[PDB]
Design a protein around this ligand. Structure first.
Ligand SMILES: [Cl-]
Ligand SMILES: [Cl-]
Ligand SMILES: [Cl-]
Length: 185
C-alpha cells in the first residue's frame, strides 16, 4: 500500500488544489510555464534556475482524495485563448550535438480519463531521498492497464538545458522537488 505524497508542511497532496513545484533542497527555483519560441500559447514546462506557475493534480479515482506515491496522475498548470493549453504531457524532440531523441514535458495534452489514446498525459510521483523531508521525483511510467500493448520506456524526470531554458525532461536523471500549497485554509 502506497502512502500519500506530502507537501512541504507534511500534509497529503489533495487533488484539484494548487501547489507550486519547488526545487529542493540544494538550490534552484520553481517550475513555471514559459513560451519557448513565440508560439501562440506557452507550452514549455521549465524550472527557474534563478517565475512560478502552480499546478493541479488529478487522478479521477473515487475514494482517493490524495495523490499517492506511484499513483498515475494528470497534471495541469493553473490559470483566454490558451485555456486548453495547460495539461502536461510528454513528447519527443531531437536535441543536442548528437541529434538524439529526448522526451520533454510540455503542455498541450487533452485532459481525460486514462487510456491508450492519452498515454502521454500520465505521470507518477515517487519519494526521493535527499536528507530533507518531503522531497520527491517526478517520473514517467504509466500503469500497464492504461495501454496493455505498450512497452513503456520508463524514465525519471530531470532537467535538460535547451532553447534557453531548464526544461523538464525524461533524461532519467531525477531532479528533486517539493510541493508548496498555494492556499492554506
Ligand atoms: Cl481528480
Ligand atoms: Cl471520493
Ligand atoms: Cl511523442
Amino acid at each position: 500500500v502506497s502512502p500519500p505524497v506530502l507537501d512541504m508542511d507534511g500534509e497529503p497532496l489533495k487533488i484539484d488544489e494548487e501547489y507550486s513545484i519547488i526545487s529542493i533542497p540544494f538550490g534552484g527555483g520553481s517550475v513555471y510555464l514559459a513560451n519557448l519560441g513565440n508560439t501562440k500559447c506557452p507550452n514549455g514546462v521549465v524550472q527557474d534556475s534563478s517565475n512560478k506557475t502552480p499546478v493541479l493534480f488529478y487522478t479521477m479515482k473515487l475514494g482517493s482524495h490524495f495523490v499517492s506515491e506511484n499513483q498515475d496522475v494528470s497534471i495541469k498548470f493553473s490559470t483566454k485563448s490558451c485555456i486548453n493549453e495547460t495539461v502536461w504531457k510528454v513528447a519527443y524532440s531531437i536535441v543536442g550535438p548528437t541529434h538524439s531523441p529526448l522526451r520533454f514535458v510540455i503542455t498541450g495534452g487533452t485532459f481525460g480519463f486514462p487510456g491508450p489514446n492519452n498515454i502521454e498525459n500520465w505521470f507518477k510521483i515517487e519519494k526521493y531521498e535527499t536528507g530533507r523531508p518531503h522531497s520527491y521525483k517526478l517520473r514517467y511510467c504509466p500503469s500497464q492497464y492504461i495501454c496493455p500493448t505498450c512497452q513503456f520506456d520508463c524514465a525519471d524526470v530531470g532537467l535538460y538545458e535547451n532553447k534557453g531554458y531548464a526544461r523538464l525532461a525524461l533524461n532519467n536523471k531525477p531532479y528533486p522537488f517539493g510541493f508548496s500549497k498555494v492556499n492554506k485554509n
